[PDB]
Design a protein around this ligand. Structure first.
Ligand SMILES: OC[C@H]1O[C@@H](O[C@@H]2[C@@H](O)[C@H](O[C@@H]3[C@@H](O)[C@H](n4cc(COCc5ccc6ccccc6c5)nn4)O[C@H](CO)[C@H]3O)O[C@H](CO)[C@H]2O)[C@H](O)[C@@H](O)[C@@H]1O
Length: 428
């Protein structure tokens, strides 16, 4: 039974409980242990240990940054539902993410996003998905953002064409002064838009105030933003134990008319001093001084919202060199069929199983690698720029093979990982 968690839906720039019609405010915490990552929601002995404490905290939402899609999550997701708890979930994972230094939106990242969506979308208490987390994070990598927007578009379209509930897809951003206005506007401009927007917000440290923290300014900054907005992280730890007095302001009347709440960072203590509990060496939960403060603050918080009943495409920011360099034109939807046909017909392949940059530098000096390049500044995306890194390398190696012209099945690069594709000879 998921009775205690009706699906949340989005109307205008607010969240609403789809049964009651009452505005939904996130009172949350990040929940992630440090496959490279650990999936606490796929291990009942972990998630069932912590839910009682999460209940004590009084949270109604968790943020999870990575799950393993090959594992079951029904037991943990049901247990969360039985305590009124929802999940915000990143589609990416540290080893499969849009690389902000060398961005791409390709079939390999798309397949990861699809796997998570297919693993998690049957749960009514899945609040939403993030299509990226702080990808662009300063003025030197703004050109990463068109790739995120494409991913937002393709994730929404995949969900739309599936049989699943239409779970919203949004974005989570950082708080860099030079980029934050342009980023906010970019992700709701043009024909593609985030469904919701999270900011990792650390401006309020210790016993600050609404005016002095910068919260007042951020609030008036985001007034009228056409999609729901919230703190996907908060909790500056400059002063400890964290008083979490930012919570009184966030759910106060001035802020609750704008923001849909926030999630504290985070549950587990991991030698970074952001936890509210520490797991001891007997695998038990030790409560830390921050805990009571977060608990009492969430407990006093009583956001007053409006009910669902009582409740011009935005222009994209112009380009300026060194300031904003995200083109409005987005890359195409990654095409697994087109790309999988490269695996079938190319004479020379490379197995994934790095030295990619060396190999690229080498091969792209001998043949024209335009067709695998993707430029988020200029909005120029090559025909095979959506394929995987291996397929792109294989394409260029095969072009060099054909240009040399020996036809002796002898791929013009030495590496254990290079092989001649016998399937290429069999008469996409
Ligand atoms: O797409 C953008 C980039 O994504 C990286 O992966 C991603 C990864 O970095 C990110 O990591 C988050 C990590 O961002 C998040 N987090 C929270 C914090 C606390 O920050 C407090 C803080 C610290 C210093 C500050 C300094 C100034 C101002 C404020 C500050 C705040 N630190 N980490 O904790 C999560 C674990 O608890 C962790 O999963 O999770 C995602 C999803 O799974 C991967 O997509 C990739 O690895 C990069 O290759 C890629 O470029």
């Amino acid at each position: 039974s998921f009775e205690k968690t009706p699906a949340i839906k989005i109307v205008g720039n607010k969240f609403f409980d789809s049964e009651s019609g009452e505005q939904f405010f996130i009172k949350g915490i990040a929940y992630q242990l440090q496959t490279s990552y650990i999936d606490a929601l796929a291990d009942p002995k972990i998630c069932l240990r912590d839910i009682p404490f999460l209940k004590m905290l009084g949270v109604n939402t968790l943020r999870v940054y990575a799950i393993d899609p090959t594992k079951s999550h029904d037991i943990c997701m049901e247990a969360l539902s039985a305590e009124g708890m929802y999940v915000l979930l990143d589609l990416s994972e540290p080893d499969i993410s849009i690389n902000r230094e060398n961005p791409s939106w390709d079939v390999h990242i798309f397949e990861r996003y699809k796997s998570v969506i297919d693993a998690m979308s049957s749960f009514p208490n899945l609040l939403g998905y993030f299509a990226g987390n702080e990808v662009t994070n300063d003025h030197t990598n703004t050109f990463a953002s068109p790739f995120v927007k494409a991913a937002i578009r393709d994730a929404k379209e995949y969900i739309s064409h599936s049989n699943h509930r239409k779970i919203p897809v949004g974005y989570s951003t950082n708080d860099d002064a030079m980029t934050r206005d342009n980023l906010a506007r970019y992700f709701v401009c043009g024909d593609v838009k985030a469904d919701f927007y999270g900011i990792n917000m650390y401006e309020w440290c210790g016993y600050s105030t609404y005016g002095t923290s910068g919260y007042r300014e951020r609030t008036k900054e985001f007034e009228g933003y056409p999609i729901p907005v919230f703190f996907s992280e908060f909790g500056c730890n400059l002063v400890r134990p964290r008083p979490f007095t930012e919570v009184s302001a966030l759910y106060g009347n001035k802020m609750s008319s704008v923001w849909s709440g926030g999630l504290a960072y985070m549950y587990f203590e991991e030698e970074n001093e952001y936890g509210v509990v520490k797991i001891n060496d007997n695998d038990g939960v030790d409560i830390l001084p921050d805990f009571k403060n977060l608990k009492k603050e969430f407990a006093k918080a009583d956001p007053k919202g409006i009910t669902e009943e009582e409740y011009e495409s935005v222009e994209c920011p112009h380009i300026a060199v060194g300031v904003w360099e995200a083109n409005e034109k987005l890359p195409e939807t990654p095409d697994r069929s087109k790309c999988a046909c490269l695996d079938e017909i190319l004479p020379c392949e490379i197995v994934p199983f790095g030295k990619y940059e060396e190999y690229f530098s080498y091969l792209c000096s001998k043949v024209d690698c335009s067709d695998i390049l993707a430029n988020g500044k200029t909005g120029e995306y090559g025909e095979f720029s959506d394929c995987s890194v291996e397929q792109k390398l294989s394409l260029q190696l095969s072009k060099l093979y054909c240009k040399i012209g020996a036809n002796d099945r002898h791929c013009p690069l030495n590496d254990k990982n290079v092989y001649f594709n016998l399937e290429s000879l069999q008469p996409c």
